[PDB]
Prior knowledge:
The structure is cut from a larger assembly and holds chains A and B. Chain A contains no helices and six strands. By secondary structure, chain A is an all-beta fold. Chain A is rod-shaped, with a radius of gyration of 17 Å. By secondary structure, chain B is largely without helices or strands. Helix content of chain B is 0%, strand content 0%. The radius of gyration of chain B is 17 Å and the shape is elongated. At the A-B interface, loops of A face loops of B. It is classed as membrane protein. The entry lists the keywords GPCR, membrane protein.
Amino acid sequence: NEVKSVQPGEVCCWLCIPCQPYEYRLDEFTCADCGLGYWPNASLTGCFELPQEYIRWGDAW
Amino acid sequence: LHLRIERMHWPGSGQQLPRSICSLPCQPGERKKTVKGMPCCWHCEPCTGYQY
């Protein structure tokens, strides 16, 4: 759920920042994201589809 | 430290003693102007959004 924020700097000592909660982790050094209407994988390993919502047959509405 | 800058001190290029500097100032304002462990240089993360 977190990425190593970069600073080549003096030495290779990294910071850590959690990604945007909808942005997953395809690279250890940078988050990744996918289209709107979509979602991150639980381990943030790719794009995931939020389940479609509609007025259902039995709902209160 | 008795220097004389007006005594033709320009290092051959530009004007008014061109400078080495690790990171420029950021006048609009930065979330922390976050310095690394070496204190003479900083990363500018701006005060974007409601955090100004």
